Each structure stands twice: as structure tokens, then as C-alpha cells.
Short mmCIF file of C-alpha atoms in Angstrom, two decimals:
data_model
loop_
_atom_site.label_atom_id
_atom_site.label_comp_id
_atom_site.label_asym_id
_atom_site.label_seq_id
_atom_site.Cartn_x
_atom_site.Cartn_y
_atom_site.Cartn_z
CA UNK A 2 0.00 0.00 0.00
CA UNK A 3 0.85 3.65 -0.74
CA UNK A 4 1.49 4.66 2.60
CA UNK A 5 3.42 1.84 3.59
CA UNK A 6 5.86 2.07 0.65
CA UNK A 7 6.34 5.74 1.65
CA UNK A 8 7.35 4.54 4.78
CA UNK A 9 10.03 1.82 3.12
CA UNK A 10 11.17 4.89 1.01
CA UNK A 11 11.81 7.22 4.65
CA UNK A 12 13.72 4.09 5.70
CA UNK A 13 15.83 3.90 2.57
CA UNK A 14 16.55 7.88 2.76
CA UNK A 15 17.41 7.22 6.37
CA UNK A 16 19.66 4.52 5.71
CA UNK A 17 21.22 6.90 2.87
CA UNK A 18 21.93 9.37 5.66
CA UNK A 19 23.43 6.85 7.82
CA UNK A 20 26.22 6.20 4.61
CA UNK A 21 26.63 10.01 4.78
CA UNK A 22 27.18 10.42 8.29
CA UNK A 23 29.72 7.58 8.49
CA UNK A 24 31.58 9.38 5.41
CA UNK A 25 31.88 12.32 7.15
CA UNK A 26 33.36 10.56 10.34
CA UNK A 27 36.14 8.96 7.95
CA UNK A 28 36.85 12.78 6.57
CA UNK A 29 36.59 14.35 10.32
CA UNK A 30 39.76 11.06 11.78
CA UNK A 31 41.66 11.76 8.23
CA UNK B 2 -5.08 12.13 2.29
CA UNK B 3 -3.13 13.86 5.87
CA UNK B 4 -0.91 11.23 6.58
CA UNK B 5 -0.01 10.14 2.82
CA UNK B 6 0.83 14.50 2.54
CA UNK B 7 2.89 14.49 5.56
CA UNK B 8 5.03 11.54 4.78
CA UNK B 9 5.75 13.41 1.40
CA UNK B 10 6.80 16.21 3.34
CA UNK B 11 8.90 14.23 5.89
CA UNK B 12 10.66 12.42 2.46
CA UNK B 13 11.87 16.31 1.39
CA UNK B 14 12.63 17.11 4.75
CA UNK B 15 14.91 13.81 4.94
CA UNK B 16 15.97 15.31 0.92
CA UNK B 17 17.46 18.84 2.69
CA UNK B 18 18.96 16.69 4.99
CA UNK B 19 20.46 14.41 2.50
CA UNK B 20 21.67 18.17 0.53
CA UNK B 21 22.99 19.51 3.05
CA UNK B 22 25.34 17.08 4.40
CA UNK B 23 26.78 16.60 1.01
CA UNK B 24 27.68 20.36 1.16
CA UNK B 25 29.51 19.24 4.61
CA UNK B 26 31.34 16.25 3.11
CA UNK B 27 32.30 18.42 0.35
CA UNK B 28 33.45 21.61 3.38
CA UNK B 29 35.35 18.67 4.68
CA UNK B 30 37.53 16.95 1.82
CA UNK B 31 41.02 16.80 2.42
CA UNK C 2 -4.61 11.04 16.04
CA UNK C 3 -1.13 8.87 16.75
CA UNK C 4 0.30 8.49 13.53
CA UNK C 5 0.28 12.47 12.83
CA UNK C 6 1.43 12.76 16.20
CA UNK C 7 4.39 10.40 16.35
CA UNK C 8 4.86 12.13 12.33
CA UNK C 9 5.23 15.84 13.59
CA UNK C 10 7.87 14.46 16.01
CA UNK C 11 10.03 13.39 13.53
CA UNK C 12 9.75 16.35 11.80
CA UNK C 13 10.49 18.71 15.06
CA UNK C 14 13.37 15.64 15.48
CA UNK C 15 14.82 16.66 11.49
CA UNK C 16 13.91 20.04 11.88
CA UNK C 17 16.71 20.10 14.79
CA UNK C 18 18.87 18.07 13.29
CA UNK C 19 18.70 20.89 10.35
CA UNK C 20 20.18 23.29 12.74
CA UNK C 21 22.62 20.67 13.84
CA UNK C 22 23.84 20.93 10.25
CA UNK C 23 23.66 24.62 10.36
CA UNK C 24 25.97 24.73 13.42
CA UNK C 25 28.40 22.36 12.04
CA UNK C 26 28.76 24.07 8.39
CA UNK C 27 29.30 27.45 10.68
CA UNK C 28 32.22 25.54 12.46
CA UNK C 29 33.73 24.40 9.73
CA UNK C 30 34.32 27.78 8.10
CA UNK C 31 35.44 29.40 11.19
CA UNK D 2 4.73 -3.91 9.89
CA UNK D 3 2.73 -1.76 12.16
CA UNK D 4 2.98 2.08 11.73
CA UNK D 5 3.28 2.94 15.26
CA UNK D 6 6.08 0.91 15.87
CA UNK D 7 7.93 1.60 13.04
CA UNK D 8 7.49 5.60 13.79
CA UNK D 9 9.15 4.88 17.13
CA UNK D 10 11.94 3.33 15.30
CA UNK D 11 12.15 5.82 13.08
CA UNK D 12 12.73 8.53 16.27
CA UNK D 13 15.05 5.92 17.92
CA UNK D 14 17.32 6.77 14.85
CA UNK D 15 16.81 10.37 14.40
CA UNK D 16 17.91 10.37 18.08
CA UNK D 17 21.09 8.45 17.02
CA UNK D 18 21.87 10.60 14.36
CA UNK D 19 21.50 13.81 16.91
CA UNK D 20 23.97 12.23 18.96
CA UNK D 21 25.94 11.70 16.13
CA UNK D 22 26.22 15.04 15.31
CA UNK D 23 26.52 16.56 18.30
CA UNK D 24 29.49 14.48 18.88
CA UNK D 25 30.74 15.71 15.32
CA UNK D 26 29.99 19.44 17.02
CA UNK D 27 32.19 18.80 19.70
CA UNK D 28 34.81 17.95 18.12
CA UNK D 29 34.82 20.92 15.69
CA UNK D 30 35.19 23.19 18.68
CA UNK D 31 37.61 21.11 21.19
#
């Protein structure tokens, strides 16, 4: 259903974010 | 359609979010 | 009811973590 | 799965990732 794939996709972006965040720990040790 | 509108805006929200911290990973390379 | 409830927290919960992001890009150029 | 529970789990990990970057704040100024 439509809400519950909007809710797969805000898990997906979140997950995204969590990539991001653990880039920008590598940059912040190096 | 309340809930399907504010998941929509919570997915752009989570978009900015996304944005901006490619602007810090970019601030941040070496 | 709930499920706009529990929604508008996780927007006041991005919304902060916008000016977390505001803070940081602010740090990095000083 | 059920909405409720998954919008708790989404906060869980908004609250993560404001811990996250408040660490990431901290160390920008120390």
C-alpha cells in the first residue's frame, strides 16, 4: 500500500543518511 | 489524504537533509 | 490522532537536526 | 509492519543521528 511504501522509502533515505554520516566521520579522523 | 501529505513532506525534509550534508562532506575533503 | 502525532515528532526531530547541520557548516568555516 | 512501531523506530534513529552530530559538534570546537 501507498502509505506503507512511503514509509520503506523514509527508511531507505534514512539509511542513505546513515552512509553520509559515516563518510563524514572517515573525513573528520583523516 | 493527511498522513499520505505528511510523509511526502517528511521524504523532502529527509531530501534537505540528505543536501545539506553533502555540502559538509564536500566543506570537509582533504 | 497517533500516527500524525508520532509524524510531527520526527519532523520537530529533522527540523533540529537541520540546525545541527547549520551549526556544524558554521564551524567548519570558522 | 505496524505504523506505530515503526514511527518509534524511526525517532530511535533520528535520536542516534543527533547524537551523532553533536558528537561531530564537539569535536569541531575542542
Amino acid at each position: 500500500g501507498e502509505i506503507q511504501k512511503q514509509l520503506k522509502e523514509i527508511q531507505k533515505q534514512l539509511k542513505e543518511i546513515q552512509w553520509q554520516l559515516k563518510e563524514i566521520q572517515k573525513q573528520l579522523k583523516g
